[PDB]
Amino acid sequence: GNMTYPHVQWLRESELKHGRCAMLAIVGIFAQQSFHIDGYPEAPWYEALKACYDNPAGIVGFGIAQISAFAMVIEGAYFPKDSWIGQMDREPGDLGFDPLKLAKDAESMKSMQLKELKNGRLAMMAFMSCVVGHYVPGSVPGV
Amino acid sequence: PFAGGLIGGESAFAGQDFNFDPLGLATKCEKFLPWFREAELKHGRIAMLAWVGLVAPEFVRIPGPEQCYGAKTVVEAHNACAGDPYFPFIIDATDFYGKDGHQVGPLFQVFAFCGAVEMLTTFAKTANVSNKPGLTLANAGDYRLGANFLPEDEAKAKEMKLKELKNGRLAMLAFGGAITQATLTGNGFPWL
Amino acid sequence: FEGELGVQAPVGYFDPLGLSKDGDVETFRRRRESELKNGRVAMFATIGYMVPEYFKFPGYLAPSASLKFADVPNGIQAITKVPAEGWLQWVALCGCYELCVNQPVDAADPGNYGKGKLGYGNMVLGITAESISDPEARKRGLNSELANGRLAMMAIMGLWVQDGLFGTPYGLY
Amino acid sequence: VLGNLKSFSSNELAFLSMLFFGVGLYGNLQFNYYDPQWAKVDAGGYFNVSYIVESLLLPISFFMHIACYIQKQNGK
Numbered sequence A: 001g002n003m004t005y006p007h008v009q010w011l012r013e014s015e016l017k018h019g020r021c022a023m024l025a026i027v028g029i030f031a032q033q034s035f036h037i038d039g040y041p042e043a044p045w046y047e048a049l050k051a052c053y054d055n056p057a058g059i060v061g062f063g064i065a066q067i068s069a070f071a072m073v074i075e076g077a078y079f080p081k082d083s084w085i086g087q088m089d090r091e092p093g094d095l096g097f098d099p100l101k102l103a104k105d106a107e108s109m110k111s112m113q114l115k116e117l118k119n120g121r122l123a124m125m126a127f128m129s130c131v132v133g134h135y136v137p138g139s140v141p142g143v
Numbered sequence B: 001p002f003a004g005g006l007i008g009g010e011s012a013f014a015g016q017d018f019n020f021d022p023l024g025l026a027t028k029c030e031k032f033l034p035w036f037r038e039a040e041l042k043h044g045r046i047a048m049l050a051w052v053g054l055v056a057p058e059f060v061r062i063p064g065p066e067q068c069y070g071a072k073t074v075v076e077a078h079n080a081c082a083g084d085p086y087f088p089f090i091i092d093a094t095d096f097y098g099k100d101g102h103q104v105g106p107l108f109q110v111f112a113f114c115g116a117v118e119m120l121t122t123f124a125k126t127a128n129v130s131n132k133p134g135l136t137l138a139n140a141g142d143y144r145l146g147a148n149f150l151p152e153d154e155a156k157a158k159e160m161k162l163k164e165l166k167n168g169r170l171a172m173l174a175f176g177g178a179i180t181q182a183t184l185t186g187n188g189f190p191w192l
Numbered sequence C: 001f002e003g004e005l006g007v008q009a010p011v012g013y014f015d016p017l018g019l020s021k022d023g024d025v026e027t028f029r030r031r032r033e034s035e036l037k038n039g040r041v042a043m044f045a046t047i048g049y050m051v052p053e054y055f056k057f058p059g060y061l062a063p064s065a066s067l068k069f070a071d072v073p074n075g076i077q078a079i080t081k082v083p084a085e086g087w088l089q090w091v092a093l094c095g096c097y098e099l100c101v102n103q104p105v106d107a108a109d110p111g112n113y114g115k116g117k118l119g120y121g122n123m124v125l126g127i128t129a130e131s132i133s134d135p136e137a138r139k140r141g142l143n144s145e146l147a148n149g150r151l152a153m154m155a156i157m158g159l160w161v162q163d164g165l166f167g168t169p170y171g172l173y
Numbered sequence D: 001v002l003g004n005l006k007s008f009s010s011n012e013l014a015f016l017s018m019l020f021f022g023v024g025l026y027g028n029l030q031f032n033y034y035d036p037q038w039a040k041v042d043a044g045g046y047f048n049v050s051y052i053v054e055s056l057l058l059p060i061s062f063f064m065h066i067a068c069y070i071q072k073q074n075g076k
């Protein structure tokens, strides 16, 4: 009689959040391997955050403060209220972030939702493969 | 009304109320308005005394013990008179007469008397069980000391209270400026 | 939104991209509010580029680091020199003045928080400003505000470009 | 439920909570990791009084957010 396990609304919200985060994270790993930004410590993708935390000086401290503040503000502003029960007013993952209004029609919205979910799942799997391959050298061929 | 009808919120120009509460502290904490008025008047009184106390020592100095009364300026006067106790307000027990130089000075005496007066006047008026109305907006800052002097007319009494409040506020600001300027330049009266 | 404030002799409606063609009143209101805020901040930034060139404050910007106002150079170079703590506290002051003491009195007209002409209701604490009674005066003042905001928005970008081109904000001179 | 803060608006409560959180987190991190004071105190110096007073603001910031939410949820 206590709602210990989340509603499918919360599950879809978390799935979309993970898909977006991992879609950013995979390209971030590749682009951190390739490029770099002056003023930030040199480290692999699996230690960059720890290095930034350990050596805040110059611009890295301010930058990581900015990133953390932005993330926390966004999470607070778009907390999935009552989605744990399924009584969430807005659609799961619908933060309203559509600056360019690429998708507006219902059919286009559904097709784009499916495409986003597929790509987010692929990115989640790729990021998990990266992490597991690095932390168990022989687990994944590419890494 | 504004700030529970307390005096002092009226502009110099007739017909306009200055009502200076930028932070809206009166509305935010109305139940503490009598306490705020008491604190304002107390600060004004201590400040009106303290400004003249910054000015006069330059003209005259009483010949007390030279450990403090030989202080160069008002900035160092507090440090000289407070002594060098092992703890800020701790009397030396082994060396009561200050032969080791670690004894509180005359500022401790005046502080103790100020504490007695405070506990017997302000805390007495505010917290005493036998004084149930206690500290209210009407009597805030009123200890009946010299009340026989103020003019009988209620309008003139209000004007005199307003004069007290304005002079106390001006003295607060003036003492702040005077002591800060004294610290910065360490000069005589013009920068106190 | 052609009749709204911001149309004058040099150009008319001037919406080449037609971003306001959809005629969404809420979107136009947000756009105008952001325009006014950007213009005001740009005017502040232009003056803050202009004044340090001649006058620099006395004292220590960061006494802990022995950083004097004369040590740090004005311009984009100041972002690194001024401590992140100082930048965060500037952000904190701006957030205070955005959330607490700047409140939209009327949603119909954006960018107006009741601070009066030349935003003089925030000159000093403890004063309340009044809107200009004359409709012509209101219109002229608001149009001047918007035009100067646009000019400062362009000028601050120009000064950033000059600071990039030459280490000092006025290297050419 | 907010006691004396019931007269504070949701906007100013939010600003106060955010500011207190920032200052307290800065003080805590500076005191603990990025500007440790244990070595200085052992040498004999006094603490950085700013960090101790600042660090108390973090729990104050937390409770100020719950108060901001309560006030906002109440239409103030």
Ligand SMILES: CC(=O)O[C@H]1CC(C)(C)C(=C=C/C(C)=C/C=C/C(C)=C/C=C/C=C(C)/C=C/C=C(C)/C=C/[C@@]23O[C@]2(C)C[C@@H](O)CC3(C)C)[C@](C)(O)C1
Pocket: A099, A100, A101, C019, C076, C160, C161, C162, C163, C164, C165
């Ligand atoms: C219809 C629809 O919905 O779509 C849109 C609509 C709308 C309203 C437009 C939106 C928006 C907002 C937008 C698009 C906002 C864009 C903002 C931009 C592009 C800002 C650029 C700043 C560049 C700077 C500071 C460069 C600074 C460069 C500097 C300082 C360079 C400096 C130097 O180069 C110099 C000059 C010389 C070099 O040698 C050295 C260096 C230092 C590099 C929406 C809502 O989002 C969606």
Ligand code: KC2
Pocket: C040, C041, C043, C044, C110, C111, C112, C113, C114, C115, C116, C117, C118, C119, C120, C130, C131, C132, C133, C138, C140, C141, C142, C144, C145, C148, C149
């Ligand atoms: C942040 C800094 C800032 C700057 C640098 C700045 C510069 C200029 C210039 C310079 C060229 C002009 C000419 C100008 C003119 C007017 N400003 Mg303005 N202003 C700033 C801030 C505010 C705020 C907060 C408000 C405000 C306003 C008005 C009104 C309206 C008066 C009325 O209502 O009768 C007029 C005529 C109020 C308003 O309603 O604006 C829609 C209002 O709330 N301003 N302002």
Ligand SMILES: CC1=C(C#C/C(C)=C/C=C/C(C)=C/C=C/C=C(C)/C=C/C=C(C)/C=C/[C@@]23O[C@]2(C)C[C@@H](O)CC3(C)C)C(C)(C)C[C@H](O)C1
Pocket: A023, A024, A026, A027, A097, A098, A099, A100, A101, A102, A119, A120, A122, A123, A126, A127, A129, A130, A140, A141, A142, A143
């Ligand atoms: C792990 C691994 C491998 C792998 C792999 C795989 C399958 C990787 C897959 C990666 C994948 C599938 C990556 C998607 C990224 C999507 C991004 C970045 C989108 C950003 C989009 C952004 C930031 C924004 C979009 C907007 O639309 C928004 C939201 C609103 C609009 O108004 C505005 C715009 C248009 C801006 C190898 C190489 C096969 C072997 C080796 O072992 C290592």
Ligand SMILES: CC1=C(C#C/C(C)=C/C=C/C(C)=C/C=C/C=C(C)/C=C/C=C(C)/C=C/[C@@]23O[C@]2(C)C[C@@H](O)CC3(C)C)C(C)(C)C[C@H](O)C1
Pocket: B075, B076, B078, B079, B172, B173, B175, B176, B177, B179, B180, B183, C124, C125, C126
């Ligand atoms: C209200 C108003 C306005 C206003 C205002 C403003 C800006 C007001 C500002 C007020 C301000 C800033 C007031 C500072 C006071 C500082 C004091 C009291 C410091 C005392 C310090 C003292 C007593 C220190 C003493 C010692 O350190 C000494 C010297 C030596 C040491 O050995 C010993 C000790 C420690 C004991 C506007 C803006 C004009 C609008 C409207 O028009 C009206």
Ligand SMILES: CC1=C(C#C/C(C)=C/C=C/C(C)=C/C=C/C=C(C)/C=C/C=C(C)/C=C/[C@@]23O[C@]2(C)C[C@@H](O)CC3(C)C)C(C)(C)C[C@H](O)C1
Pocket: B008, B165, B166, B167, B169, B170, B173, B184, C058, C059, C060
């Ligand atoms: C009479 C009366 C009223 C009144 C009044 C009046 C006359 C009010 C006057 C207020 C006044 C006059 C307020 C000054 C503030 C000055 C400040 C904050 C200075 C800071 C200065 C600083 C921070 C300086 C720092 C430095 O020195 C440092 C530390 C190092 C040096 O290298 C140099 C520098 C500069 C860097 C009311 C309210 C109107 C009505 C009421 O009824 C009663």
